[model samples]
Target: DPMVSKGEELFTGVVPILVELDGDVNGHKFSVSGEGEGDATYGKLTLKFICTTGKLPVPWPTLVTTFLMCFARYPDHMKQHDFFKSAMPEGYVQERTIFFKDDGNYKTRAEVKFEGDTLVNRIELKGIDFKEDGNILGHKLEYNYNSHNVYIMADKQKNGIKVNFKIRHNIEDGSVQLADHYQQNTPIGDGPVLLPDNHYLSYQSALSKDPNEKRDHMVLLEFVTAAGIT
Candidate 1:
């Protein structure tokens, strides 16, 4: 066997997820930013979620203790798995067909044992798999050196929504610093239809078409950082 550097040995994707926040959960703002670097063999992801008063009064948040999201790829065989069985909606039977990312064609898992045991909530971007049951991969974002989209797929069950987002690259100043953009996700559906609400996930929410209580959806996320990959 020939020897090559780990960075050059395998193809890895960075999972720099940006979970959104509307109003603070309690009385503070929150954010979870980190990177995932690994191949089919294994990977380790570290996140630092923090809560602040949105001010410089006092900083109560710190870098999480390098909590590990041990990355492991699931076996490819198109057999049903528990991850999909549990996360699926009730009254609906979803099996390995979807869990297998459809046709036994996908593998990657970012295991989250605990969010550093903090109140700072977090969720993986887990990009789309398509209209079929294999509609959501277990990994994370679409990381590009030049640019990337903050795209997301969601709804009552899953894959009920697919929209494209627009984000500008930090190429002007060539600064690898945090960037921000405000643009709504345009529903790339066959037009517009109501995405019904559900209580499957204990009040599993949706984009209701309420006028007085208007339905407005927004996401808060930005590309933090990424490095060490060929």
Candidate 2:
């Protein structure tokens, strides 16, 4: 009971993270998946899935659903954050998250800002966590951002598809509807990889910033997918 006194106006209820992968896009059939690690946690979050395009035509390559995966490439890697940051209506920040120092333990945080009482400004998820190895349905999920691109191994049969970009926000009462699509400068299939159009390793979601009145230290949400019409 006294914990609330340790922090000013402390409000919480887990604000659980929910993520899902692509379904079907432009007549293209995609499948979603994931097991363990993908569970909701303040330390990290995830969503594992792949395409069912059968080996893929362009061969394909690429993708995030939580916190934020990988990162923007260099030289001209500014991407959407720059574009949107400049477009924000007006806001202020103080670093938002259930665990402020959680980033050091894991990586990435639901970075957001507000304008007074209402949840204003931006809702951003970084999609980055290197040197980590987990599994998706018994396959391998190796993040290799520093040396090379990430590597996800298929199961004994094979079936891991993907790229990143997603979010949602806006509205008073601490409810966020941030569904901003941060596209990579060189997107092949929504993700920063090579693939056909109409396909996406879509990372999308929406959730309550908080149910508490007079809310602050707000951030995070759901996983959504799109292909212009799918």
Candidate 3:
């Protein structure tokens, strides 16, 4: 009954998002999740998951969100697009083997995972082929400085997870121009709350003499890192 009630709220009220994946690169499609309590210094959301495709051997969903926030905390080193790829190095590998349900759709899906040796295989954008309008496949995926941190829910177990962050680029505005919806000063676990020691704007002005100096400072990758999250 609780699940039924929750399902009703999910399908009727909140909108469902679609995250398309490559069938070849990933044997199946996967789902991600996390949770934390809400407060002033920092709040957290409780996460629940459902893997329609793959299985989570450990925990990872929490880390993805944490790293996402870290990026927001330090908008200099990472971009929204970069976070997407950074969260999942080997397509969200787990620490141990998980026996997932086989539906025969050829798309594996999972929520969390663990890792022994994370190996990141970088690929050039040009090499990737277009699968659809917003879908591409090759070696890895990407989120940009402008990409928004999205909230997602699995089943009736709990609420969705939120992410927040800022982004930097080598643009005329000194690379600290772009800020997305989540980056704004909203609530905890949604935007970059804990900022760097030196405000990027002030730091740039004080450090740079070249009018053409690029805003190329390092940013933080602040997402949750729990048992298997990171």
Candidate 4:
């Protein structure tokens, strides 16, 4: 019942949101943009990124697939959009297999539950039988309701790496400006040069489009490696 209620909360009033992923890996800066729409109660959300820039850990397509897997942390979104199911049945755990190219296939396991006073959701992925020990080895994501953030670790600390990304909602500002021609759907010879802060603002504006619907924002993709792990 709690899961159903939570699903409603996540899916109800869903609307369009612009995703701005900014931050750095190792030391190189990275930024990616995309448009997203979904509802948890209904079951899945769609995320499409138009640009990906940075020192990538994996190839572009592989990286995108990995990123998409993160949505498993919010199973409600998946149920409504990507993987629909009338009911979660009992035990509240769902496991499935996902295949990929260049990288390999991975089996994904997702589960959600309440811990202490906060809700907790987790996703674990392991590579299938392949040439290497497990190209993906192990990719785990844990989401805590208390923090509204997802903590991620990959390849069992292959290079002492981890990710901390936050999901934010509750918009108070609705004002937006088309500072560049790219946003106007106008003919421009050059691409839009958007700074990190500018991109964040633009993303916020996109979320504010439908005042009637509730929107959430995932601002940046912050990464920390062993060297910088003070």
Best by TM-score: 4
Global local distance difference test of model 2: 0.23
Give the Å error, residue 115, model 4: 23
Q: Per-residue lDDT for 94-207 in model 1, tens only?
A: 111112212121111222221221212233222123322221111121222233422323343443423232222222234332222221111222322233221111001111
Provide TM-scores for the models. Answer: 0.22, 0.21, 0.19, 0.27
| Poorest lDDT segment (10 consecutive residues) of candidate 4 | 178-187
lDDT of 4: 0.29
lDDT of 4 at 45: 47
Q: Per-residue lDDT of 1-230 in model 3, one digit per residue for the tens?
A: 33223212222221222221222322323333222211101212222223334542222211122222211122323222222223332232111111111101112223221133211211110111222321222211222233233332121122122223332322332433221213221111232211212122101101112245232211212222111111
Q: After superposition, which runs of candidate 3 have C-alpha atoms over 4 Å from their true positions?
A: 1-27, 33-37, 43-45, 57-230
Full-model lDDT for every candidate: 0.23, 0.23, 0.22, 0.29
lDDT of 4 by residue, 95-166 (tens): 434443333444544443333322233444454443332222221111111112223332122211123332
How are the candidates ranked when ordered by TM-score, highest leading? 4, 1, 2, 3
Error of 3 at 163 (Å): 14
Q: Which regions of candidate 1 deviate over 4 angstroms?
A: 1-23, 26-43, 52-72, 78-230
Task: List candidate 4 stretches off by more than 4 Å.
Answer: 23-28, 52-58, 65-230
Of the candidates shown, which would achieve the greatest lDDT relative to the real structure? 4
Q: Which ten residues in a row have the lowest lDDT in candidate 2?
A: 97-106
